[PDB]
Design an enzyme around this catalytic site. Sequence first.
Site, PDB file in Angstrom:
ATOM      1  N   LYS A   1      59.219   0.223  66.699  1.00 15.60           N
ATOM      2  CA  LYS A   1      58.526   0.697  67.888  1.00 15.60           C
ATOM      3  C   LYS A   1      57.975   2.108  67.696  1.00 15.60           C
ATOM      4  CE  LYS A   1      59.902  -3.209  69.054  1.00 15.60           C
ATOM      5  NZ  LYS A   1      59.045  -4.318  68.536  1.00 15.60           N
TER       6      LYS A   1
ATOM      7  N   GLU B   1      63.675 -12.920  78.604  1.00 12.92           N
ATOM      8  CA  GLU B   1      64.359 -14.205  78.749  1.00 12.92           C
ATOM      9  C   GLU B   1      65.889 -14.080  78.799  1.00 12.92           C
ATOM     10  OE1 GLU B   1      64.355 -18.590  78.700  1.00 12.92           O
ATOM     11  OE2 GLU B   1      62.593 -17.614  77.801  1.00 12.92           O
TER      12      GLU B   1
ATOM     13  N   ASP C   1      54.405  -5.737  66.807  1.00 13.41           N
ATOM     14  CA  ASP C   1      55.760  -6.111  67.189  1.00 13.41           C
ATOM     15  C   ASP C   1      56.780  -5.711  66.115  1.00 13.41           C
ATOM     16  OD1 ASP C   1      57.636  -7.091  68.924  1.00 13.41           O
ATOM     17  OD2 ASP C   1      57.407  -9.195  68.349  1.00 13.41           O
TER      18      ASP C   1
ATOM     19  N   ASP D   1      53.826  -5.612  71.907  1.00 12.35           N
ATOM     20  CA  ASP D   1      55.001  -6.115  72.615  1.00 12.35           C
ATOM     21  C   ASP D   1      56.035  -4.999  72.773  1.00 12.35           C
ATOM     22  OD1 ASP D   1      56.559  -7.995  73.953  1.00 12.35           O
ATOM     23  OD2 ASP D   1      57.518  -8.747  72.107  1.00 12.35           O
ATOM     24  N   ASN D   2      56.930  -5.145  73.747  1.00 13.22           N
ATOM     25  CA  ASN D   2      58.084  -4.264  73.934  1.00 13.22           C
ATOM     26  C   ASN D   2      57.706  -2.831  74.298  1.00 13.22           C
ATOM     27  OD1 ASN D   2      59.463  -5.970  71.086  1.00 13.22           O
ATOM     28  ND2 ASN D   2      59.907  -6.432  73.240  1.00 13.22           N
TER      29      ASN D   2
HETATM   30  C1  LIG Z   1      65.085  -2.442  64.467  1.00 18.54           C
HETATM   31  O1  LIG Z   1      63.993  -2.997  65.111  1.00 18.54           O
HETATM   32  C2  LIG Z   1      63.194  -3.878  64.417  1.00 18.54           C
HETATM   33  C3  LIG Z   1      63.586  -4.317  63.152  1.00 18.54           C
HETATM   34  C4  LIG Z   1      62.782  -5.211  62.450  1.00 18.54           C
HETATM   35  C5  LIG Z   1      61.600  -5.661  63.028  1.00 18.54           C
HETATM   36  C6  LIG Z   1      60.721  -6.598  62.269  1.00 18.54           C
HETATM   37  C7  LIG Z   1      59.795  -6.011  61.266  1.00 18.54           C
HETATM   38  C8  LIG Z   1      59.406  -4.687  61.204  1.00 18.54           C
HETATM   39  C9  LIG Z   1      58.539  -4.574  60.141  1.00 18.54           C
HETATM   40  C10 LIG Z   1      57.856  -3.331  59.682  1.00 18.54           C
HETATM   41  S1  LIG Z   1      58.352  -1.869  59.855  1.00 18.54           S
HETATM   42  C11 LIG Z   1      57.257  -0.995  59.179  1.00 18.54           C
HETATM   43  C12 LIG Z   1      57.233   0.496  59.048  1.00 18.54           C
HETATM   44  N1  LIG Z   1      56.213  -1.839  58.708  1.00 18.54           N
HETATM   45  C13 LIG Z   1      56.567  -3.323  59.015  1.00 18.54           C
HETATM   46  C14 LIG Z   1      55.695  -4.474  58.649  1.00 18.54           C
HETATM   47  N2  LIG Z   1      58.419  -5.801  59.558  1.00 18.54           N
HETATM   48  N3  LIG Z   1      59.188  -6.684  60.270  1.00 18.54           N
HETATM   49  C15 LIG Z   1      60.313  -7.861  62.966  1.00 18.54           C
HETATM   50  C16 LIG Z   1      61.332  -7.908  61.884  1.00 18.54           C
HETATM   51  C17 LIG Z   1      61.205  -5.214  64.282  1.00 18.54           C
HETATM   52  C18 LIG Z   1      62.002  -4.320  64.985  1.00 18.54           C
HETATM   53 NA    NA Z   2      59.397  -8.240  70.112  1.00 17.04          NA
END
Ligand SMILES: COc1ccc(C2(c3cc(-c4sc(C)nc4C)[nH]n3)CC2)cc1
Ligand code: NA
Length: 220
Positions: free
Chosen positions: A143, A198, A140, A168-169
């Site tokens: 993406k 939602e 999650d 997800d998504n």
């Molecule tokens: C702009 O869309 C988003 C922005 C933030 C997020 C979150 C997120 C992403 C990551 C990443 S990214 C990566 C390369 N490794 C990790 C561990 N940690 N937390 C959920 C906060 C999800 C979607």
């Molecule tokens: Na999500």
Amino acid sequence: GDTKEQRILRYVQQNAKPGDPQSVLEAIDTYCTQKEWAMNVGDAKGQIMDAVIREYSPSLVLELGAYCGYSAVRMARLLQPGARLLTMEINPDCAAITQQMLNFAGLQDKVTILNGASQDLIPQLKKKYDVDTLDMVFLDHWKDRYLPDTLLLEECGLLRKGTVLLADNVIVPGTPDFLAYVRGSSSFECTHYSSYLEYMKVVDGLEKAIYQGPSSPDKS
Ligand SMILES: COc1ccc(C2(c3cc(-c4sc(C)nc4C)[nH]n3)CC2)cc1
Ligand code: NA
Ligand code: NA
């Protein structure tokens, strides 16, 4: 300086009960549906996650993208004694919120929070966090990273036959490269779980992909 994520945490601490993960989930879902929108798996998708956890009873779970900790609370509360959740969160302040969220829920002993990028942390799991293989992976995070991190998990040897990936998504905003790959590959047995967003009145979905083992080289 007040942030949305601090506000979510504050709302939980005020209205939920410490040591009661279910009240924490309800607090966040209430906040995000009534006060202020936030990236949140929400309760509908959460019930699909619960069912997956209950069906496969994972002993070791990897979460990518903890954000404020809603999914970490959702999953860890269903983990058995000795079971572990490893969750990865690239943003330092969100990682801190997640730790406080789990602490409040009484689940901090079941969860290890790793602050960093998935592609940097995934290859350290065997050496540094004494991981053999993962029972389940929940995706999650960003993406565009679903496909490359899935390929990275495989080549690092972290997947075994039976490992459940739950992503997800996969429809909104969409991960079509990830979907094409796992659905078409004989290394993954896939099923799709549709769910209404939602907030948005658009259909989304989670993909469940069960690893079958590495694909066999061509024979004689
Ligand atoms: C702009 O869309 C988003 C922005 C933030 C997020 C979150 C997120 C992403 C990551 C990443 S990214 C990566 C390369 N490794 C990790 C561990 N940690 N937390 C959920 C906060 C999800 C979607
Ligand atoms: Na999500
Ligand atoms: Na497949």
